[PDB]
Amino acid sequence: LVKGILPLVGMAMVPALLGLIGYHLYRKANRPKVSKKKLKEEKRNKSKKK
Amino acid sequence: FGFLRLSYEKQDTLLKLLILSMAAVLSFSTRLFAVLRFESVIHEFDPYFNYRTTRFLAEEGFYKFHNWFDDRAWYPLGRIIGGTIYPGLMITSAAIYHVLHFFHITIDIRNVCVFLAPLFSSFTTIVTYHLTKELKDAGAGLLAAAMIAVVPGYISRSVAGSYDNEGIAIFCMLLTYYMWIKAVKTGSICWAAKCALAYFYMVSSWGGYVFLINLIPLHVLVLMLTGRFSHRIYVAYCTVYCLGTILSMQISFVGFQPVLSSEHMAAFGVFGLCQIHAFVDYLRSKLNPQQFEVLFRSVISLVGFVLLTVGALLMLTGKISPWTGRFYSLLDPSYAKNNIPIIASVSEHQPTTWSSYYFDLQLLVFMFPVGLYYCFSNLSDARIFIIMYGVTSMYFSAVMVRLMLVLAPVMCILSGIGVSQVLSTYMKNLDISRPDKKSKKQQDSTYPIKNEVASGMILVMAFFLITYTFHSTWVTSEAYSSPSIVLSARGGDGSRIIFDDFREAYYWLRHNTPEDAKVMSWWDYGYQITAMANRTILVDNNTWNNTHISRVGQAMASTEEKAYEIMRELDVSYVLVIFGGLTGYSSDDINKFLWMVRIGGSTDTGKHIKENDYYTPTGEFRVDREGSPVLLNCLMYKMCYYRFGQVYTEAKRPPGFDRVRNAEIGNKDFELDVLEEAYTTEHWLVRIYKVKDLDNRGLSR
Amino acid sequence: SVVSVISRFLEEYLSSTPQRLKLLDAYLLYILLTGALQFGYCLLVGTFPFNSFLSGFISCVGSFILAVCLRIQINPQNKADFQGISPERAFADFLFASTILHLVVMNFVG
Amino acid sequence: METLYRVPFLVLECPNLKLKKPPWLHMPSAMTVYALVVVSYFLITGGIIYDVIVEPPSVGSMTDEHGHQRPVAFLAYRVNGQYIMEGLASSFLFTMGGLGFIILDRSNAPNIPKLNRFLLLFIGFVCVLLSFFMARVFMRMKLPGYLMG
Amino acid sequence: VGTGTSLALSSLLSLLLFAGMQMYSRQLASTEWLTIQGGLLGSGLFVFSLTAFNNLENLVFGKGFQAKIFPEILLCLLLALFASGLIHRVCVTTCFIFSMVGLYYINKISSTLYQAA
Amino acid sequence: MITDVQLAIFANMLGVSLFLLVVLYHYVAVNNPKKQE
Ligand SMILES: [C][C]([C][C]/[C]=C(\[C])[C][C]/[C]=C(/[C])[C][C][C]=C([C])[C])[C][C]OP([O])(=O)OP([O])([O])=O[C]1O[C]([C][O])[C](O[C]2O[C]([C][O])[C]([O])[C]([O])[C]2[N]C([C])=O)[C]([O])[C]1[N]C([C])=O
Ligand SMILES: *[C@@H]1O[C@H](CO)[C@@H](O[C@@H]2O[C@H](CO)[C@@H](O)[C@H](O)[C@H]2NC(C)=O)[C@H](O)[C@H]1NC(C)=O
């Protein structure tokens, strides 16, 4: 199994690892900018709490 | 926190010393592969001539060496060694040798020559860092030193035991450029004087000085066209030209070429132009503009006519020599192939292929444009020169493979600049390295990934750099570590078997022949025979006389009877030929037979020799039964294949087969009327025949 | 008229030149006269001996050019261009260059 | 003499000539020269000069036991020999790798849109990685023992 | 004369010169003097061709069109040079030289006739 | 005497280390505040 399959694992694992890194980078890049408007609403509630 | 408490000035200096120190160590060490694998011997054919000269100079003294006339070569014409050589390489070796003995360190002269080349490679590394630092910064300079140290292209001609002019020529060239750059940038006369002195040293070392004397005028001219000409340029260039011209002329070999040759005219023309330009500016400032036009037009008309007439007269009269054959070819590629057979014959004069470029340089080829782009983006007077140096080297390196060495220095420095720019730009992109001054607001929300982007970019660059080291190491170990004189073959069992036939034949001649004997061979082996055999030779590698070589070619290509007549006239005693059929050595005489045919027929006496005669009716060169009758009966064919028909080269092939041509000889049985077999090597690589005398009874032989 | 222009050019030059600069111009005229005279001799009497004629003629040009370089470095108008160079440093370099020139011409004079 | 030229123009309409410097003929810009150099670099590394002197075929031919003429693109086992097609293909890769860095550098400039910046980066890495990696394959075929020990 | 007739006349003169040059090409190249005679003919062909080209430009694009150094002047010179090569290489120097001498005076003539008016 | 195998490994090791150090030099050089002063 090792002599026939090992070349295939090399060809298949590299794309899989690149996809996994790309997915990590995409997830980190897709971090959504917290709406400053919702933050302003928190500030508005902060003045009610004070 | 121990490193942090040290001042930054300490940190930068400490790293600078460590990086440069290691680079010098690597440059020297990498060149020792040949000396370890094989014996400590001189490599190649040309270096032996230098070795013999170096010994004569050290033992005899400079004054005797200067006037040395050698009668043992180019018999019977002779050669004047003192006036036809470049003394730079020999003087350097002798001077170090005297110093070591002075301190009672007794080292062989042979060791000094063998190890001369690796030491200079380390010196070259230091010069590279300073020159790069001037153009851009220290960071680029450290990169350049690393690249230059292990570049395969430089290594090919600087390996241990390569006692050739190229080893020192590169170091002198870089030093001269470094002085020139400082001279222009500072504008100080003192730097200009240093630059001229370095130029003189290079002129003695190599014959390639011509390249520098044309590039420097070209750089100044471009600055004038672009409007960057300044007082600093005038002082630096003009001062160097006067001292450089006189210094170069001192060398006996150069003689009066600087002033009379068309090769050096370019420097003279630019020098005249600079005076005119400087004077015109001075007049314009003092004079009124309205008047200045009237004087300016009148002066130009009178001066221009006088200058044009003088220039035309000099070229037409022929007082200025036309370009030399060697240089004319470098420009016009076709000229050498069609007009001068001898120049075409050399195997290092062929055009370069893509594979050659990648094999020698690898990553640098990718990075070369990037360095060019940054230099164009930021134009500076010093930068302009480097662009001129690059773009010319590329053109002259394709034309001739040999000129690759000139290309290697410019390639390393420019590639380093590109790598430096990329590393600095992305690395400061990585905020973790430096918070420095930052504003969170207006931070470019078009950006999510600062940490990741820089990390990937730096990592990929590192991967390329490490690969470059591996490729350079493998190529040097496998390609440039082979001594020419000793051939390595693999036995049937796979053991490494060494063939020493080349030396063995020379030793046999040394002790077993009369001292006054004259040996005839192709010009390729002239240097080797003289150095080791210590016997007179008819032709030599320098090939100063074409007609003499052509006469030799006629004898070998002609029939047995005709060849004998020529040999008797020249008092030839022995003939040496190299045959590689038994061992599969490709570079035998038979492959080189064709060049002999063309050269022999080039002269008037060789008109009878026609190349087509040696081919089959179909245009083929074959040594089998179908070969041309003239070819089978020529002198060379008989010498190589005498008694060879009955030898079994291979078990799987019939007797008399030639392994390297993969063909069986057509003519197996023949006898030599005018030649007798004197000695043959164990593997038949070298065969020596003795010239028979006339007939005692006067019968026609 | 061109002749009128030359008269005014001399008139401005004499007033506007410091004595030290004028001394250089007088020295340069002497150097030029010697070099030109040698050149005329060569074309009238013949090239031979080429070694002597070339060595002597080159020496005149080297002296003339070296003087000009000093003439420009010391000038106040060009001080900005040759930044960092004091007059004393320029003179020391000029003597150093002259010494080399005399030595090299000396070898080839004979 | 001028009258002689007038003689044809007495019947013919003389052309109206304006001997002015052509507008397009300007001193080349610094970027313009760099572009011209880059294209030259492509040809020189390609071995165009080698092709002219040696005049090799675009592609050669080989054979096997099954016989028949395979075309050949790579000249096996001789470093200083090449075919026309092979030399140009290799040369293009070298130029592409250099450009990939320059485009990447331009991508880093500030004030670029989110979409533009991402797209430019992708092109830069693709050109650099493919150009370098492919070149190794080309040599490996030409010399079977390349980097093998 | 009328512009339409002028264009035809210039074309006819240029065409006749070119046909004659080819017909006697062997004789013209035989001797140096004859090759020089070819130089005069080639320049004349250039002058007539240039006149025809400007006349054609005026008719198609309207009267008063101005001939430029490129491509109108360059193209006419190139055509004359090509004919010179066919007879002999030597004329390309002489054939060219006569064309340039004619061109400078022709421009001088054109400036006086048109710019002054 | 050292064998060629030892020499080859030695060459590779020194080169790899040296290049990495040059990268490290670039790090400190940009990181240097006084360089920007
Ligand atoms: C090639 C080199 C050089 C480099 C340079 C360059 C690249 C530059 C170019 C130019 C220019 C001008 C550029 C610029 C541009 C513009 C302006 C546009 C060098 C080379 O080296 P060499 O030393 O030569 O080497 P070798 O080879 O080894 O040498 C030898 O050999 C030769 C051959 O090849 C020879 O030759 C001879 O010589 C003689 C003199 O004596 C004569 O006689 C003869 O004829 C000849 N032959 C032939 C075949 O050619 C030599 O000599 C030798 N050497 C010695 C030293 O001896
Ligand atoms: C190489 O051959 C020369 C040529 O003869 C040898 O020179 C002889 O040297 C011996 C020993 O010193 C003298 O007695 C002879 O008079 C020399 N002959 C000539 C013609 O000069 C030289 O010794 C040989 N080189 C060696 C042996 O290294």
Short mmCIF file of N, CA, C and O in Angstrom, two decimals, chain B residues 19 143 419 423 427 458 461-462 465, chain F residues 17-29:
data_model
loop_
_atom_site.label_atom_id
_atom_site.label_comp_id
_atom_site.label_asym_id
_atom_site.label_seq_id
_atom_site.Cartn_x
_atom_site.Cartn_y
_atom_site.Cartn_z
N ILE B 19 28.29 38.65 9.90
CA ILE B 19 27.83 38.26 8.57
C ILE B 19 28.98 38.27 7.58
O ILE B 19 29.18 37.32 6.82
N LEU B 143 23.43 41.32 1.55
CA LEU B 143 22.83 40.37 0.62
C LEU B 143 23.76 40.10 -0.56
O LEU B 143 23.91 38.95 -0.98
N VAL B 419 16.07 42.09 -3.77
CA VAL B 419 15.66 41.33 -2.59
C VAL B 419 15.57 42.26 -1.39
O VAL B 419 14.67 42.13 -0.55
N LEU B 423 12.20 42.85 0.94
CA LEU B 423 12.22 42.47 2.35
C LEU B 423 11.88 43.65 3.25
O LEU B 423 11.08 43.51 4.19
N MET B 427 8.40 43.79 5.45
CA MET B 427 8.72 43.56 6.85
C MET B 427 8.20 44.69 7.73
O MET B 427 7.68 44.44 8.82
N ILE B 458 7.52 37.07 3.57
CA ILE B 458 8.88 36.83 4.05
C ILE B 458 9.23 35.35 3.96
O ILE B 458 10.34 34.98 3.57
N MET B 461 10.22 34.20 0.47
CA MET B 461 11.53 34.68 0.06
C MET B 461 12.62 33.85 0.70
O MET B 461 13.62 33.50 0.05
N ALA B 462 12.43 33.47 1.96
CA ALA B 462 13.42 32.63 2.63
C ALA B 462 13.56 31.30 1.92
O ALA B 462 14.67 30.77 1.77
N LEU B 465 15.80 31.62 -1.03
CA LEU B 465 17.21 31.83 -0.70
C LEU B 465 17.89 30.53 -0.31
O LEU B 465 19.01 30.25 -0.74
N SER F 17 22.63 29.09 7.30
CA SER F 17 22.65 29.91 8.50
C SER F 17 22.93 31.36 8.15
O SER F 17 22.27 32.27 8.65
N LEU F 18 23.90 31.59 7.26
CA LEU F 18 24.29 32.96 6.95
C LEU F 18 23.13 33.74 6.35
O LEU F 18 22.89 34.89 6.72
N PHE F 19 22.39 33.12 5.43
CA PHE F 19 21.31 33.84 4.78
C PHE F 19 20.25 34.22 5.80
O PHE F 19 19.72 35.34 5.77
N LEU F 20 19.94 33.31 6.72
CA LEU F 20 18.93 33.61 7.72
C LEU F 20 19.36 34.79 8.57
O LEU F 20 18.54 35.64 8.94
N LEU F 21 20.65 34.86 8.89
CA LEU F 21 21.15 35.96 9.70
C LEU F 21 20.98 37.28 8.97
O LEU F 21 20.65 38.30 9.59
N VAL F 22 21.21 37.30 7.66
CA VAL F 22 21.00 38.53 6.90
C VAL F 22 19.55 38.96 6.98
O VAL F 22 19.24 40.15 7.04
N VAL F 23 18.63 37.99 6.97
CA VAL F 23 17.22 38.34 7.15
C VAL F 23 17.02 38.95 8.53
O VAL F 23 16.30 39.94 8.68
N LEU F 24 17.66 38.37 9.54
CA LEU F 24 17.54 38.92 10.89
C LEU F 24 18.10 40.33 10.96
O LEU F 24 17.58 41.17 11.69
N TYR F 25 19.16 40.61 10.20
CA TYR F 25 19.71 41.95 10.19
C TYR F 25 18.70 42.94 9.66
O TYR F 25 18.58 44.06 10.16
N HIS F 26 17.98 42.55 8.61
CA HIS F 26 16.95 43.41 8.07
C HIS F 26 15.91 43.73 9.13
O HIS F 26 15.40 44.85 9.20
N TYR F 27 15.60 42.75 9.98
CA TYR F 27 14.60 42.96 11.02
C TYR F 27 15.02 44.07 11.96
O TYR F 27 14.25 45.00 12.22
N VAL F 28 16.23 43.98 12.50
CA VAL F 28 16.68 44.97 13.47
C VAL F 28 16.83 46.33 12.80
O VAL F 28 16.53 47.37 13.40
N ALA F 29 17.29 46.35 11.55
CA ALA F 29 17.58 47.62 10.89
C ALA F 29 16.32 48.45 10.75
O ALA F 29 16.31 49.64 11.08
#
